[PDB]
Amino acid sequence: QWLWDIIDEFIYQFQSFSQYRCKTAKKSEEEIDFLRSNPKIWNVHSVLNVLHSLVDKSNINRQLEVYTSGGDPESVAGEYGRHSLYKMLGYFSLVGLLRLHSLLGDYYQAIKVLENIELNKKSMYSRVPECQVTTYYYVGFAYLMMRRYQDAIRVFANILLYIQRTKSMFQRTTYKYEMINKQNEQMHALLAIALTMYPMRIDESIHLQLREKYGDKMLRMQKGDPQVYEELFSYSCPKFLSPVVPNYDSVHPNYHKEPFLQQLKVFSDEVQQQAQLSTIRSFLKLYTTMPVAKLAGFLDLTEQEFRIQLLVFKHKMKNLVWTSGISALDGEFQSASEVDFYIDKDMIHIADTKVARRYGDFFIRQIHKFEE
Amino acid sequence: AMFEQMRANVGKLLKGIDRYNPENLATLERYVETQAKENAYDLEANLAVLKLYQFNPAFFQTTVTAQILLKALTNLPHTDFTLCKCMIDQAHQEERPIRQILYLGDLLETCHFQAFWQALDENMDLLEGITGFEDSVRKFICHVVGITYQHIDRWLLAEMLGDLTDSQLKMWMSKYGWSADESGQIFICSQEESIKPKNIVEKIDFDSVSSIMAS
């Protein structure tokens, strides 16, 4: 009862404020102007937007994942709760992007994604690191869903770096500080499995404490064990969807695991054959143009007799991960071995290191201010 | 030409609050068939019907989802068909004709084109009933041939396209300008034109790095 005394009092206070949101932003200049003046912080005004991003999503996820029939939650929020706030004229501040990226978050859990186009187009206001890191969060996830593994893996690198010149300080990632650490860790780990004999960019993204364990995971996954298919997929699911609260686990109510059938089994199909793409590339491409010695050496390696070695070989070259040609008279297999790049880290660091100098020189000149 | 007469209407439907209202399925399920029959496409209208079907599983209609699924598979290697299974329920992937359509879809992603045309059942008149579908999948076969072959044998390219005859293959030969070579393969692409490496070449980033190191 204490459970749904808290839950219901969030939504009823948000439904209250939703009317104030629509009322102030659009037309009442003097009410906005009166609100600019009185406090020393306009931070109180702005926080309440994306504070209610993740708290409302929690409360609606509970009501979603308790009532699976005669749907009250999902059409009320979708119609009224979300579109009224966002579709109409933005408040003049970062609040226009806050309500945008609150809506982008709400739009992310729903698996209907195609208006990521126009959400970026309506992000007219400048990309502050606060708004930008949370844009690249979802935009990278959108590329992860687009099967643009090579694009998304770069986008996850920057947001996990912790020299995007974040400083926070006053609770703008609060109570989920390490979610940004572990979700970017996790979703980057899936992308490394698909392609990698290219980056050589994983050094920047993830630190060696985790690179060591996730490194051996990919190898153990693709080569010799489907065990990593399990444990990777266990950690990947809470982070792929982001279901903010799983409901109280008990057998007396059912009510909760039924949505989790869909939610989970939706992502089963993702990692299923995308993982089995990996093992083909896993065997290093030892000799770039393969004669009879190496082509048969690789067709001994693909699968054994008899039936249907060549067919399966020529099915898998198509996907994205080989570029090659067949010759008839020679009987020769000629192929493409492409590689990435060595050092791209140093020249990106040359500014980052100078920020270690800068905020060094600056913070002590704030202490040199005080004790002088 | 009913596709062109619903674009403006359905465009404002799918940007409003009518894409989480189930009542709009009248105009929307009609417009889904208008894609399939008239050989046109709109991902958003499909995905909204799929989302409204995911909302209330009872309103799911098998043929309307087949008209989504089949036309998703014409548009590969895009993630249109990825977004289909994401909204289609556990119950709803075991329906007819859905189960056969999904299985055939799996073959196209893993690019088992030989197995695709073997797998076909020819008594399902719905798969004949989608206009330009039989050629669309063939155009996607030849699309990926161009990306990852430098040559292909005449018998080989035939078999991938459903065991074509000599005369049937003349269309596909002419389509991307492909032509015969000595003994006796069909040319697809030049060897240096297919590979396209963008590998080792950087460390030419002097200008920016000196502009920031200027002071």
Side-chain angles (χ1 to χ4, degrees):
Chain A
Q1 60 182 6
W2 183 84
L3 185 55
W4 291 90
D5 186 59
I6 294 170
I7 299 158
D8 195 61
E9 193 174 1
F10 276 126
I11 303 173
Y12 189 66
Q13 188 174 356
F14 298 159
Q15 289 292 103
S16 292
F17 294 167
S18 294
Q19 303 180 2
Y20 285 99
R21 294 292 181 194
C22 295
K23 182 171 65 178
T24 51
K26 298 203 301 292
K27 187 175 180 179
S28 51
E29 300 181 1
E30 289 70 57
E31 193 171 2
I32 299 172
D33 192 59
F34 190 65
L35 194 61
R36 293 173 183 131
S37 52
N38 300 306
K40 297 184 177 63
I41 42 178
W42 55 283
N43 300 113
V44 182
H45 311 151
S46 295
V47 162
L48 296 168
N49 291 279
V50 168
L51 185 64
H52 303 172
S53 186
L54 192 64
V55 176
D56 200 8
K57 177 175 288 301
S58 194
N59 304 130
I60 296 295
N61 192 42
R62 293 188 185 96
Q63 293 183 337
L64 186 64
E65 298 179 353
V66 165
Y67 293 109
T68 60
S69 53
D72 305 300
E74 199 170 13
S75 294
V76 171
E79 297 178 0
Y80 181 65
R82 270 55 174 169
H83 298 175
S84 298
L85 302 181
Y86 176 55
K87 194 174 184 297
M88 303 191 291
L89 187 59
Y91 182 98
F92 308 121
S93 196
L94 281 64
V95 177
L97 293 186
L98 293 169
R99 295 198 295 180
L100 192 149
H101 298 307
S102 186
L103 187 275
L104 182 56
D106 298 317
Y107 194 57
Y108 184 63
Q109 191 178 24
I111 328 182
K112 197 290 184 179
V113 277
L114 181 56
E115 302 182 356
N116 306 114
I117 303 173
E118 188 173 356
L119 294 169
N120 294 342
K121 190 179 178 181
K122 293 176 68 180
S123 294
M124 300 180 288
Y125 189 73
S126 192
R127 297 183 298 177
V128 182
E130 302 174 3
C131 301
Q132 192 171 10
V133 169
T134 59
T135 294
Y136 284 132
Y137 204 63
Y138 297 117
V139 168
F141 301 151
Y143 295 147
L144 158 68
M145 290 164 173
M146 196 179 174
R147 300 186 295 167
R148 293 302 304 156
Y149 313 94
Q150 199 177 5
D151 295 358
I153 196 169
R154 299 189 296 247
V155 174
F156 294 157
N158 302 303
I159 56 179
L160 187 49
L161 186 62
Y162 198 70
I163 315 178
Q164 298 297 289
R165 294 78 183 241
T166 53
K167 190 178 186 180
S168 304
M169 197 174 290
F170 199 66
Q171 57 177 359
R172 299 189 295 271
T173 52
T174 190
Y175 310 121
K176 286 299 188 179
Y177 184 64
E178 301 185 0
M179 189 176 70
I180 310 177
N181 190 8
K182 190 176 170 61
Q183 186 151 313
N184 294 335
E185 173 193 299
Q186 188 59 49
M187 296 291 98
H188 185 285
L190 180 56
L191 298 178
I193 295 164
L195 295 184
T196 298
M197 54 168 57
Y198 295 96
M200 306 176 182
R201 298 189 297 268
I202 306 181
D203 298 297
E204 301 89 81
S205 59
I206 296 179
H207 311 298
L208 186 54
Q209 184 179 1
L210 294 163
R211 291 198 307 261
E212 189 173 359
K213 185 175 293 300
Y214 279 104
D216 196 58
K217 272 176 175 295
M218 174 183 75
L219 302 172
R220 192 169 71 257
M221 188 149 165
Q222 65 194 333
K223 300 179 67 181
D225 292 295
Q227 184 180 0
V228 194
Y229 186 74
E230 188 178 2
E231 188 177 358
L232 193 81
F233 193 63
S234 70
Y235 299 153
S236 290
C237 291
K239 298 301 187 298
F240 206 104
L241 183 62
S242 192
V244 182
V245 55
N247 289 261
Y248 182 59
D249 298 300
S250 185
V251 186
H252 305 296
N254 186 0
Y255 301 164
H256 315 308
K257 190 172 290 183
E258 302 180 354
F260 283 128
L261 299 175
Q262 181 68 355
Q263 293 172 14
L264 298 169
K265 294 175 184 179
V266 161
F267 302 143
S268 191
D269 302 302
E270 300 286 357
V271 189
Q272 188 174 5
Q273 300 185 312
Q274 295 179 17
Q276 200 170 9
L277 188 63
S278 307
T279 316
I280 316 166
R281 183 274 306 144
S282 188
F283 178 67
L284 300 172
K285 300 178 186 183
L286 304 182
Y287 203 54
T288 59
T289 291
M290 294 186 175
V292 186
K294 294 292 162 296
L295 176 58
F298 187 52
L299 286 163
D300 190 53
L301 198 144
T302 300
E303 58 182 3
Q304 204 54 246
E305 62 180 2
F306 188 72
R307 196 176 290 105
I308 43 166
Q309 303 181 356
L310 298 173
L311 286 67
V312 175
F313 176 54
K314 292 173 181 181
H315 299 326
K316 286 170 168 179
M317 291 187 293
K318 299 290 94 190
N319 304 126
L320 196 61
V321 294
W322 296 85
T323 301
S324 55
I326 313 300
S327 187
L329 291 169
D330 300 301
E332 184 177 0
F333 178 59
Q334 304 183 0
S335 199
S337 293
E338 291 90 352
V339 291
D340 193 54
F341 180 43
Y342 191 20
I343 300 166
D344 55 3
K345 68 176 68 61
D346 288 350
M347 301 296 100
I348 300 176
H349 292 316
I350 202 154
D352 295 346
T353 195
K354 194 174 182 179
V355 173
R357 179 168 169 78
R358 183 60 179 177
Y359 185 43
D361 296 352
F362 185 69
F363 189 83
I364 266 299
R365 289 175 187 154
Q366 300 301 108
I367 299 297
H368 187 72
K369 185 70 173 182
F370 304 150
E371 61 174 356
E372 180 178 297
Chain B
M2 295 294 185
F3 190 71
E4 295 296 302
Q5 297 174 21
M6 284 191 265
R7 303 193 69 169
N9 189 26
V10 177
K12 298 182 180 181
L13 194 160
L14 298 171
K15 203 61 57 177
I17 55 172
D18 297 295
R19 63 181 187 156
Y20 296 128
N21 191 13
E23 299 175 0
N24 285 262
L25 284 169
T27 301
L28 288 169
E29 296 178 8
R30 188 172 68 246
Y31 186 56
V32 164
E33 187 168 2
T34 307
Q35 293 169 45
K37 189 175 184 297
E38 306 188 358
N39 198 3
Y41 196 65
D42 188 2
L43 185 55
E44 196 179 4
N46 291 351
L47 194 56
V49 169
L50 289 172
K51 179 60 191 65
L52 288 170
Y53 292 170
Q54 194 277 316
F55 177 56
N56 292 328
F59 297 149
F60 187 89
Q61 214 295 297
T62 55
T63 312
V64 182
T65 304
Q67 291 161 359
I68 295 171
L69 286 164
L70 292 163
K71 301 299 293 185
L73 292 166
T74 63
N75 288 299
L76 287 174
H78 307 301
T79 50
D80 296 359
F81 190 72
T82 308
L83 290 165
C84 291
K85 292 185 173 179
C86 292
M87 296 295 195
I88 296 166
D89 198 60
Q90 182 183 343
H92 295 166
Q93 287 183 3
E94 300 180 0
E95 297 296 300
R96 179 176 293 276
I98 302 297
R99 191 171 70 256
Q100 293 75 33
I101 293 171
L102 290 174
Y103 186 77
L104 288 164
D106 193 65
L107 302 170
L108 290 174
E109 186 177 3
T110 56
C111 300
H112 291 47
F113 303 138
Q114 288 86 354
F116 179 77
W117 300 106
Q118 188 177 5
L120 182 60
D121 299 299
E122 300 177 358
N123 299 109
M124 185 177 287
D125 301 297
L126 188 60
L127 307 176
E128 186 180 0
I130 312 306
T131 305
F133 175 68
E134 303 182 1
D135 296 295
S136 282
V137 178
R138 291 183 180 115
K139 292 170 69 177
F140 166 59
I141 290 164
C142 294
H143 179 62
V144 177
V145 163
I147 302 169
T148 56
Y149 272 148
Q150 298 168 356
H151 301 282
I152 194 174
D153 192 60
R154 193 172 187 86
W155 184 259
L156 185 53
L157 183 58
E159 187 181 356
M160 289 182 173
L161 300 167
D163 199 4
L164 300 179
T165 62
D166 191 72
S167 190
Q168 289 173 357
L169 192 60
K170 292 183 171 64
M171 301 182 181
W172 304 97
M173 186 178 179
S174 296
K175 186 167 291 301
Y176 292 119
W178 299 335
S179 193
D181 189 58
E182 183 180 359
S183 302
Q185 296 184 290
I186 294 176
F187 176 80
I188 296 298
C189 194
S190 189
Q191 306 190 350
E192 58 185 1
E193 185 59 59
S194 56
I195 55 177
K196 296 179 170 175
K198 287 83 62 177
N199 299 350
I200 294 164
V201 296
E202 298 181 356
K203 285 294 188 181
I204 55 176
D205 305 297
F206 177 65
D207 299 299
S208 189
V209 171
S210 60
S211 294
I212 61 179
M213 291 164 61
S215 296

